[model samples]
Target chain A: MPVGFIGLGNMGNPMAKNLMKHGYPLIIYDVFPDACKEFQDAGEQVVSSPADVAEKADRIITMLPTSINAIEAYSGANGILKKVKKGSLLIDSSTIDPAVSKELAKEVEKMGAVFMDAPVSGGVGAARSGNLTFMVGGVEDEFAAAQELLGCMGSNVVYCGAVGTGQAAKICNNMLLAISMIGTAEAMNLGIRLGLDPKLLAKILNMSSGRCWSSDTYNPVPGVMDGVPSANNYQGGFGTTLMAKDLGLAQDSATSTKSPILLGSLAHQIYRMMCAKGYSKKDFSSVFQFLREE
Target chain B: MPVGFIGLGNMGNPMAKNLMKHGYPLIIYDVFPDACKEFQDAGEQVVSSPADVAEKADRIITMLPTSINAIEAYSGANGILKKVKKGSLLIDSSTIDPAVSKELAKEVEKMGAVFMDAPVSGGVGAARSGNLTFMVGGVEDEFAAAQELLGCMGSNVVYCGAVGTGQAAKICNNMLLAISMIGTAEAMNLGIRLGLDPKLLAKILNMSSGRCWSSDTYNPVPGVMDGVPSANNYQGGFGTTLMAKDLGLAQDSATSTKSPILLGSLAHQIYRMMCAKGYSKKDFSSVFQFLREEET
Candidate 1:
């Protein structure tokens, strides 16, 4: 009962390694050979391509960057869909749109396979710690089949509604997060300019009406908070580019469904400004730089 | 010495009454005379007009609605300045624009009266408790003369630069606040709608990247927490109309100074919509209602 893992990156690599680390037999495939060696080094099987991995394993999981890449890997000639056995289980943990998840699940079911969409939150740190919150969406039979493997990599493994709901949950959470972080930076900067001591203000706001996570635990002012992205000059948390990408997913979802997205629109614009300032790779909290007093 | 007070409302009435409670004589005027009775009944002189109060008091403090009302009450024909003695101290705790504060402060000085634009934070509750934060803007002499009286009403008093800075501090603090509150509301709603437990989502966000005041303390989700307007059906805190007014000031100031308001423009529009939803009197935190799943 070996597991097949594909599309290993900073997040996917650690997750797949964790499965192998837990004494599960694993057959891994990533276009990058470097990503597949962890399974090989762990004395598990490594394949040259996703199709090879699919042929060797009963359960296949993909943790890719986007729905398009996941589709390219799982659909078409050299893809896992053509090679996997009937009744084999499939799961996609990519941060993507719900429609793609449903489309892939539908096609996978037609192939006599079970499919699930289980997107994880908490980036690399949580991925390494195996404490990621999994927002899973799929059929009940598929959920029951894949819960154990998902549990290996995530802490809160929830079967949230239906086939596309996981993607829906991820985008909504990330979209709103973008707005909250930027908004907190703006308020904290203004208060500092108005003679409120940054640390003391953080305490008062945390206790008062003005408190928020960004202010209380992750104050954006430099030298105020320790271990947060603010103190590290805004490096390595969730990248601003990633934030913009998630917001794009949210905007697309809102536009396609005609949901009026007022605040999401504001968050998108602020992220754009942050990206323009060459902060695409920095943590999203670096948005404080733009809102800070010059 | 007697103090002149005007515009007794949720904020003014309690603050003025506190002065009389602390054994100072207060001569007060209010548009609604019923609001004037509390101070008068406290053994202080109740006056018919702003000028009458000014004629008899050594210091004047105003906690009115807008800059327009404040301006007229102090600079109107036969208003406070006409009756106030030369060198009388003046402090205004009502929130308004920095530019307007500067205008009034300049006018008051030429007429031989000392004036400081000293707006306050902490709502009616803090006003009642005598622990509000005052952001004062004026010349050193005016601030020195009025500091003692401001101490009676608030605990944290900051001299923020010169005239108009008090209003600047206020609007700047408030504009940031409006954006952050809206941001927090949208994030919480987004998380809740996406199947994350509202409580767990709040905790994760409080620890993660998406933390802010609205989410951490004044959560917009009704019944999730206590002491907030949301838990009490968005009953009372800061009014939506007041938020709209402050955001408007920020927008107008940005336009006049070419400071490039950026995000505050969107904040103003959102708050305007919140205002149009008949939430003008509810807490500003109620902006979440417009952004939540029910609106879907």
Candidate 2:
């Protein structure tokens, strides 16, 4: 039996390769044919369309960039729904609005195919190393089926409830992540301004109640940690624009759920402001630079 | 030589006991004489005024609550300065404005006494256990002499630089602490609303980029951690009023330094709002209760 893998971008390409290591034959496709070129040359089946992949495979995995993109790959004229078999399993590994995920699940159910929204955390490094954390949501019975593929790609697979809860958990975690990262940024900045040494202040924060992942692991201060974006001048990690987009999803969720996210709201506005001021391409931790006096 | 211990409130009381356990005889005072009863019965001198304590002891440690109180004890009538000895040492373990600490340091200097601000972290329990963290700031030459008494009451004594940096570090660490705690509060609140289990969500957060001391150690949500204020209906921890006060000091520092602290400013507003809503005495983690759907 072959597995359908689509959207071979930065994260998708390596993810598809890891699937091959598990001995699952791939029926791969991408919007850009060039993206499928390497997989095609590696002697896997390169299909002409998402419908073609669905025509050949029962388990389809779509790793796209946006909700609209996921929609096109699954619902377009020559999309997966056009040819997806009854009882086939369709899983989307994109970070999108939960509402969109729900809508897509409903549409996929109409075609007699099961849909699960499985979003991931960790960056390109995690994807390449097969250490991503996948938060999955759909029907309970089909989890083991989805797990067979998702487990090959990630180390942690959490089963959130129902159709869109995976996206819910993702954005919720990201909302909190954004808040803490910015908190760490401004806190470190304020301490340095108050004449506390950066490394010393970070040590104190890490040991104290202020400790967080942003403060302890991926510290935003330059010279405080090595091999991080901050040490490399805020390059080669999750971009501010991508984080802004995830926060956008979080804001949408917060609004729809009527959840009050004070620091989260402020964090979104700060990242939005950062994007406008040419921080769009830099690592999200570059927020330290944005909030810093220097 | 007898050492002077002042401000025997809940925290100060245990702290002063720790000093006594280290074999320092006491000359103690408080605004309320009732606070001095136990120590007096224990054979320590219960002085009538700050100046009276100054008259008897050359080494004095004051742990007053507010800047005005610290000022009154040091500058008011019958205050420490009214009958101070030259070359005495003064250590304040109150969390007040660093600006006030610097101001008091200059006043102590004029009287030929040394002033070092040595504010603490950890609450009553830590004080009782002699496990508080002391952040000390003063003339570099006098840190060790101040440390002798501070070391008796605390487990970790970090010497931050020049007159007020201890308060600077204390407030800076606390501002970040407040932000993360509130962030953990709302994040946990939002996750539970999204139908994630409280324990699972906390585990996910602790294992992810969302991990913080508030999330992993002192989670705001009930049933998440035992022995925490949240587990006990938000009782017996740092009060919301106290956090609001510290944020007030942080705001003062930010404004005076002209530094931008958008989250710190908004956190101050939230805690202030909590204080007004009758959560003034509840643990600050009760921000979860305040920001919860039950209220909104």
Candidate 3:
């Protein structure tokens, strides 16, 4: 039995290749035939449509970009639901709205298939090296089966509650990450400008209640640490544009939930403006530079 | 030799007692003479003014409330500078603007007295137990002398930098702390509302990049941790008003330096509003309650 893969873009391309390296054949489809060429060249089956892939494979994983495209792929004229097998497992590994994940879970359930939202939380490098963390949300009984496939491509397979909670967990983590990263940057910059040493400030913050992943592990200040984007002039890590996108989702989720996102909202605007300026290509830690006094 | 002390209010009362517990006799004063009654009754010398305190003892520690009071206590006719001994050591342990501290240090230098800004980072409880963390900023040569006195009342005595940087370090730590505490509160509230278990969600966050002191140690969510404010209906911890004041200092410093403080500014506003609506005395972690939806 082959596995079905869709949407082989930057994240998906490496993820799909890693799936193949695990020795399971793929019935893959991408709206763009160009993405399917390499898989096809390697003697993998390249289907013309999502329906064809669903007709042949009982398990399918999607890695689409937008919520709308995810909906399109699962319910379009040639969507997976059009020919999906009964008892099929459809796991979506794309970062999207939890509401959409819930809606898609309902649609897949109506087709007698189990749907799980399994968003990944690593960069392109994690995808290329097969070390992504997969946050899966679906039936409890179906988790072991889902983990078996996800385990091949990810380092950690976290089971969040029934459908859509995986997306919720990812949104929660990223929202908190955005807030603290900006807070760390703002604090270190202010401390440095106020005649405090950057390393010393970070040292105290880590020892004190101010400690967080940003301050201890990925400090944004230049010369605070090595092997991070900040030390490398804000390159080769999570991009500002990508963070802006996740923050967009966070704001949308918070808005719909009537949740008060005081700093989250401001963090969104900060990153949005960073994208408009010279930081779009830089790592998200470039926020340190965004708020730095030149 | 008696140690001169001023401002025997909430924080000062306990700290002054701790100094006495360490076998140091006190030369104490307060704007409210009532504040020094217990010390005076304990056979320690009670002074009518700051100048009287300086006349009685050369080593003085002032734990004041505001920048203005601290300045007045050091520079007024009845202040420490009025009858100050040459080469005296004065340590101001109030949380104030570093700029004001630097100004006070310059004035004290003309009198040949060494002044250090040594603001503390724990609550009144920590003060009572003599376990506070003291962040000291002054001349490099004067730190050991300052630490010797501060050590009697605190657990960790950190030497930050010249004259005002101790205040800078405190403000920086507090600004990031306010942002993260509220961030932790907001994140946990959002997660709980989104159908994740409070304890499980906290467990995963602690394991991930979202980990912070607020998440791992001082969690804001109820039932996630024991013996914290949220566990006891948001009582007995750092007050929302105090966090707002520190954030205000953070904003002032950032504005003076032309630094961007988009999130810090908003965090200040959030805390200010939290103070406005029944959360003034509640622990700052009560922000979780402010953000949670009420069974709607």
Candidate 4:
């Protein structure tokens, strides 16, 4: 059965290509017709709208940018709801507000289709490599059904629980990640200023209580690690703007849940400030550069 | 020759005892003489003043609590400098301001003594077990001499640099450490609220970009790891008050060097608040409990 794939942007394009590589026929659509051109040329079907794609496929995957984009693709007049089959499995792989996922799930159920929120964690590199980790939130009975499709594009397909939890996991992890990355940047810069060798300081942190993913693996300090964005002028991997946006989602969720995220909130503001300071497009690890002494 | 050991507080007591186990004779002192009772009963000589110890031993090690204590032990009227012998090696293994370490070194050098700031990283558990990692800073020629005694109480002895870099390395490492720990706590709590299983979340973080010493090794969330402070209600590890003090040293060093520690500074404030909220004596990992939502 052909999988209806929509939103062929940076992450989506690679993901859609991977589905094709897995031998799953694709019915593709994008707001920009050119974004769909390559897929159409690759012998896949290019549809005009979400409804057009839904008319032909019982399983559809949407990888969009924001909550609003997700809602428009699903709930609009020409959206997936217009022609989605009663038993169609609809999976959204966008990182968005979990509340929106819940809302979409209710609407999809009313239309007799299954909706699963399966937000991804790895970035463009993982997307291109088909090794992303998907945190899926939906019915347990239908998980194997969702997994059959999500597994084609991801390496780890975790079933989080009912609607919104997938987004919950992604946002929560991202919020923490942002906090630690900045914490690492601060620690690295301070250590450098205090005369400890960057590599040696990183070694000390990795062995001691200070160890974190930022310091040990994707070290933000240039020359400490290779192949990461830090060693490459912070060009690739997760962007600061995207991180800031995810943190905004985290902030909203924490606000509604009445959870106090003291450091998480501060981390959100730091990234927001980074976005405003010309680091919006750089890797989130550029925070080391952002916080480093000029 | 007897090695003078001063300041028999929680960290110092075990360290001094470890030196004794390594077969070194001791001349010990503490402001509270009773603090030296165990060592004294064990046949170690208990001295009245720092100067008195300086007279009795050419090699002395001070494991104190703060920069003030270290300064008093070295610069007071009855301090080590008053009667120190020429070529004496003075090793202070206390976490303090690097500037203070430098000041003490100058004074020791003036009295024809060698001063090396050799701060230890591991907590009381490591101290008791003789597994501490010592970060030593002083003349390159004097490190081996200092290591002979430090190696008795610590498992790893790293030569950081010239005078005060030992304190610098310790402070810098700790400032980053406090930031990462609190960051881990916030991440762990937020994930739990989002319905991710604590153990599962910890595993994912440990494998992912969220991995850190706090997440993988000394996880702050209860039930995450065995034999850690978190498993024991945050008891028997580094104290929140002590972390606050180290961050204060980091803050002071950053200010003097014009270094920017944005998150490090905020972490300092957080631990300071944790101390004020009556968590002064609790292990630093208690920040998870501090940030966790109250059960309804």
Winning candidate number (DockQ): 2
**Could you give candidate 3's per-residue lDDT for residues A95-150 as a string of tens digits?**
99999999999999999999999998888988999999888898999999999999
Q: Please, what are the lDDT tens digits per residue for candidate 1 over residues B33-136?
A: 88877666767788888889888987889999998999888888857877878888888888887778878888788878878888888888899999988878
lDDT of 4 by residue, B1-296 (tens): 79998898889999998988989999999999889888889899999999999999999999899899999999998999998999999999999999899999999999988999999999888999999999889998999888888999999998888888888878877887787788778777877877778887777777667777777888999998998899998886899999999999999999988887778888899999999998899999999999876679
- TM-score between candidate 1 and the true structure: 0.82
What is candidate 3's lDDT per residue for B1-296, written digit by digit as tens? Answer: 88999998889999999889889999989999888788888899998899999998989999998888999999987999999998899999999999999999999999999899999988888899999988889998989988888899999899888988889999999999889988888888787778888887797788777899999989999899998899999887998988998999999999998778888888899999999999999999998898887775
TM-score, each model?
0.82, 0.97, 0.93, 0.96
Model 4 CA deviation exceeding 4 Å by range:
none
Model 2 CA deviation exceeding 4 Å by range: none
Per-residue CA lDDT of model 4 for A142-255, tens digit only, reads 999999998989999988888888898788778878888888887778778877778877877777777777777799999999899999999978889999999999899888
RMSD of 2: 1.5
Each candidate's interface RMSD: 3.9, 1.0, 0.9, 1.6
Model 1 lDDT per residue over A1-294, tens place: 889988889999889867866778888888888767756776878887778888899898898887778898889578888887898988889888788888998888888888788888888988998888887887766676688999889887776667887777677667766765665675556555544456645654554455555666666778888988889988898888988888888887776765556768878877887888898998888887877657
- Per-residue alpha-carbon lDDT of candidate 2 for residues A1-294, written as tens digits (9 for 90 to 100): 999998998899989998998999999999899899899888799989999999999999999999989999999999999999999999999999888988999999999989999999988998989999998889989999999899999999988888888888888888888888998888888877877788877877877788889989999999999889999989889999999999998787778888899999999999999999999999999999998876
Ranking by DockQ: 2, 3, 4, 1
Candidate 4 TM-score over all chains jointly = 0.96
lDDT of every predicted structure (CA atoms) = 0.77, 0.91, 0.90, 0.89
Candidate 2 pairs with clashing backbones: none
**Per-residue CA lDDT of candidate 2, range B1-296, in tens?**
89998798988999999989999999999989999999999999998999999999999999998999999999999899988899999999999998899999999999999999999999998999999999888998998888888889999888888888889888988999899899988888887777777887888888888888999999999999999999998888999999999999999898888879999999999999999999999999999999887643
